[PDB]
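Internal tracking record. Fields below are filled automatically when a chain is submitted to the structure queue. Please do not edit lines marked as system-generated. If the sequence contains nonstandard residues, flag them in the REMARKS field before resubmitting.
Queue: standard
Priority: normal
Entity type: single polypeptide chain
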Amino acid sequence: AEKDFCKEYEKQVRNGRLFCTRESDPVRGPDGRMHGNKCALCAEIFKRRFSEENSKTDQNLGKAEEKTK
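SYSTEM-GENERATED OUTPUT FOLLOWS
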C-alpha cells in the first residue's frame, strides 16, 4: 500500500514537499515509484493530483478569479 506509505510521507512533508525516508523500496511508477526514492512516487501523486486537482479539476481555483476569469 503505497498510498499509506505516501500517507505517512504526507506527515513528513518538508517545505511543502514530501522528503523520502531512509526506507526506499523500488517499485515501478510514473516517476519510477521508488526509482530515486519512494518520495518520488508520493510526489508523483502530488504532481498529478495537485496539478489536476489544483488545475483542470477545480475550475482552476486561484486563477479563474483573475487569471482564468
